């Protein structure tokens, strides 16, 4: 719940190792976990808040000019000077024009000339940085098992809104009864700050990395301005017209807000009005789950005469939900839910609600479960067999495995070696795979990066051809490995 | 002398009245009555929908968005024929006359 | 698929793929037919007015 | 019992108000203020002038 229809959702099986399960979760998706007991929790990530930023840089985007002084000395005696070149607030440039007795001076040469202009600034880029503290991730962890009002509605108080910061720890959270859950986040292995720059324009903000933002044109100014207006650039902005021979002149280059946006394509955007409201990015929890009842075992198989009040409602490969309305004298009991096959009973499904439970009286409790890939009879009644429902999950086994392989390829994509940490309880194989892909993606790190969609797929096809040319069985670690990783990376990036 | 205006490009623009709509999961592709004007800019997309959203059937349902398009200062591109144009030539002689 | 009096049962991809202008279900005060290259045709004689 | 309407195709149509416009030989491509509604059907062509 709070997790239905938000597809790309991260099913997690297994709790072994005692209780610890490694989960990598991000703003876009959410994670549903399972175990043989200890009922299914839902991990949705919501807003990140970096509390205390520090302003590192001001770029001017629109500028205007005034007071427009200029001067020229003479043909080759004197190179011109001007007293308002003294301020660096003025922009200045030397050039050479021509001079003669028409101009008045004498000696008929190509004499030097200066021009100067006062530099005033319009609205700016207010680029800031944040340390890897003063930032909190807010995670709503919410349980299944009933409580209508909406298997969606992330707004609402059913799942606790627990904060976490790198100045914090094991993240103890409490729920109704059973839900003492401890979460050990590792936020420093997340976005890897001290390589980030939040970038605020007039209304919006973006998250761009640091070297690019330092390397960008559109005049420099450091964070300690307030008086100064000391812009140590302006060869990238204001341009000086020089016609054929005579007097040169100043030209404001105009607002580069559109060119700025075209520059920061391929970068995630962010609302930043109230301090900060940082979004899309991932983090890595280790999850410990001892401390968990099943919201009572402590009950009976119920009497009977249930009633559906909702449709069949298939979501996203198998997860189907059914909202039943108990009728009778329950004194709240369990719900005898089963997913069976046909006659000569071969009961084969799974229930992801584990131990669903009726509330006090009439209240439309809802149940999600996964049938197999074909025919299925979902049954809920007992003594007069009360209610069966037919259902046909279209599916496949092979198609399900192939789609899971595509999910694993997308995890070998965007989320890095954290996606090797996305499983759990792996011991030897998972850890050695994470270390091997760590050093391997480090060699394919910076290290052949910085390239666009087109050039990546083109360098992929040329390197897969030179692998196809087949010398001495280097063609494998060439051609097939490199062609797979380049193509399945290039067609998936720039999302 | 006499140009004729061929084209206007907008350089800065602003948006207002900001309507948007979504149908349902795979029944209906969404419509909106202010898509009728070409002055509005419009785009279809597909998001997701479920009961949390309220509708039902739990799909990836379509959605539209719309915005009124108002324009700031423009490029006022003009053309000229190979008439209505004059060249001014000063022809001047030598031989004296200071100044 | 309902015409003036009759109806037919046709599968979905064909019915979406068919010409004869599009309009979605939320018309009412719409008449926003996003097609019409398949319907109304424009005569152009040799040189002049179309 | 309960269907849901997904689509309207028009079968017969009629036309009215029939506006047309042409600018000039190669200065100007023609515009018309009733091209603003998508309710109107519009087409560019080239004739002679």
């Amino acid at each position: 719940m709070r997790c239905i229809g938000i597809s790309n959702r991260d099913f997690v099986e297994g709790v072994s190792g005692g209780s610890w399960v490694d989960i990598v979760l991000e703003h876009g998706s959410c994670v549903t976990t399972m175990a043989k007991n200890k009922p299914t929790l839902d991990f949705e990530l919501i807003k990140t808040e970096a509390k205390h930023p520090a302003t590192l840089r001001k770029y001017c985007v629109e500028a205007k000019l005034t007071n427009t002084t200029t001067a020229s000395r003479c043909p080759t005696q004197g190179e011109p000077s001007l007293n308002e070149e003294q301020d660096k607030r003025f922009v200045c440039k030397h050039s050479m024009v021509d001079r003669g007795w028409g101009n008045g001076c004498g000696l008929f040469g190509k004499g030097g000339i200066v021009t100067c202009a006062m530099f005033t600034c319009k609205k700016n880029m207010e680029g800031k940085v944040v340390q890897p503290e003063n930032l909190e991730y807010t995670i709503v962890i919410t349980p299944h098992s009933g409580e209508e009002n909406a298997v969606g509605n992330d707004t609402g108080k059913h799942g606790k809104e627990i904060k976490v910061t790198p100045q914090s720890s094991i993240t103890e959270a409490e729920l109704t009864g059973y839900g003492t859950v401890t979460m050990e986040c590792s936020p420093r292995t997340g976005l890897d700050f001290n390589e980030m720059v939040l970038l605020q324009m007039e209304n919006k903000a973006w998250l761009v990395h640091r070297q690019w933002f330092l390397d960008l044109p559109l005049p420099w100014l450091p964070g300690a301005d307030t008086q100064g207006s000391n812009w140590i650039q302006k060869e990238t902005l204001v341009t000086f017209k020089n016609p054929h021979a005579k007097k040169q002149d100043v030209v404001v280059l105009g607002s580069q807000e559109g060119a700025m946006h075209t520059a920061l394509t391929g970068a995630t955007e962010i609302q930043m009005s109230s301090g900060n409201l940082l979004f899309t990015g991932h983090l890595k929890c280790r999850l410990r789950m001892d401390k968990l009842q099943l919201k009572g075992m402590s009950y009976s198989m119920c009497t009977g005469k249930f009633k559906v009040v909702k449709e069949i409602a298939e979501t996203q490969h198998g997860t189907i939900v059914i909202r039943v309305q108990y009728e009778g004298d329950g004194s709240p009991c369990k719900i005898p839910f089963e997913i069976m096959d046909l006659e000569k009973r071969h009961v084969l499904g799974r229930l992801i609600t584990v131990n669903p439970i009726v509330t006090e009286k009439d209240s439309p409790v809802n149940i999600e479960a996964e049938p197999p890939f074909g025919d299925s009879y979902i049954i809920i009644g007992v003594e007069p067999g009360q209610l069966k429902l037919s259902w046909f999950k279209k599916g496949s086994s092979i198609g399900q495995m192939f789609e899971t392989t595509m999910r694993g390829a997308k995890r070998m994509a965007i989320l890095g070696d954290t996606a090797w940490d996305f499983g759990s309880l792996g011991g030897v194989f998972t850890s050695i795979g994470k270390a091997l892909h760590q050093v391997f993606g480090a060699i394919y790190g910076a290290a052949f990066s910085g390239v666009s969609w087109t050039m990546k797929i083109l360098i992929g096809v040329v390197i897969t051809w030179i692998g196809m040319n087949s010398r001495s069985t280097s063609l494998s670690v060439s051609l097939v490995l490199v062609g797979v990783v380049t193509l399945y990376l290039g067609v998936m990036v720039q999302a | 002398k006499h140009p004729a205006t061929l084209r206007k490009y907008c350089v800065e623009a602003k948006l207002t009245n900001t309507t948007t709509a979504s149908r349902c999961p795979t029944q209906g592709e969404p419509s909106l009555n202010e898509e009728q004007d070409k002055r509005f800019v419009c785009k279809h997309s597909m998001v997701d929908r479920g009961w949390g959203n309220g509708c039902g059937l739990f799909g990836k349902g379509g959605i539209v968005t719309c915005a009124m398009f108002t324009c700031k200062k423009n490029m006022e591109g003009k053309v000229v024929q190979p008439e209505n144009l004059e060249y001014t030539i000063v022809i001047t002689p030598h031989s004296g006359e200071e100044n | 698929l309902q015409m003036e009096n009759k109806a037919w049962l046709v599968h979905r991809q064909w019915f979406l793929d068919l010409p004869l202008p599009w309009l979605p279900g939320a018309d009412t005060q719409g008449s926003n037919w996003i097609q019409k290259e398949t319907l109304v045709t424009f005569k152009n004689p040799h040189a002049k007015k179309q | 019992k309960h269907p849901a309407t997904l689509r309207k195709y028009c079968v017969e149509a009629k036309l009215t108000n029939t506006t047309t416009a042409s600018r000039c030989p190669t200065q100007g491509e023609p515009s018309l203020n009733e091209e603003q509604d998508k309710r109107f059907v519009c087409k560019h062509s080239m004739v002679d002038r």
Partner: antibody
Amino acid sequence: EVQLVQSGPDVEKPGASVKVSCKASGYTFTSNYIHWVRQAPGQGLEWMGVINPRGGSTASAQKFQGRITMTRDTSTSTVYMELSSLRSDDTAVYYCARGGRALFYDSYTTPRDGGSWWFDPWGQGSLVTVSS
Amino acid sequence: DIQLTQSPSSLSASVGDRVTFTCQASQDIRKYLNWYQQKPGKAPKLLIYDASNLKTGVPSRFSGSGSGTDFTFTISSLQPEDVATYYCQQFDDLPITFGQGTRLQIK
């Protein structure tokens, strides 16, 4: 409190168009749909159509095919109904109730039930007379 | 399209009587029905939602029942402030249709 306020009564010419406002108070304006219902004096009630405040999709009944337009202002929390091609049958009292909201859009029916159609929050009534 | 017949069209009864109304639908509207009062030329009020439930603030003398297509509205004790025009209304399938109406007269 839980309250809606409509505009005053209007008299228009045949073939003209009329605009009726519906201003909200007492709640979060994008937490309910707005629905417009007419009533001729020698008749019972009759549903005109539906607007969503959040976003702004509309629909209407077949008796008002192409004659009705619905807009809003989120800043003033107000809904505007504009009826076009007025004739003498349009002389009626107009009403604007609210609905429980399928969060995103439209006139859904499966989420339980709207819950009124339209007399809990509705307002005070707009009389519209089409005459010469 | 979905029609809704309301019966009877008008009634007269004395103060304290029990009165019942019947609405019939051409389709299955299984629980989607609402009952309203309307004082003439006034601001009217909801009585029953979901054809079985009171609104908070409505006195307990009102009730409603019925499941399939036939629905019964019931005032237990008729009171002199209850002279109104009463409507039943479908919610299903959305060419949303009202009943015709039921006027009351006090004896």
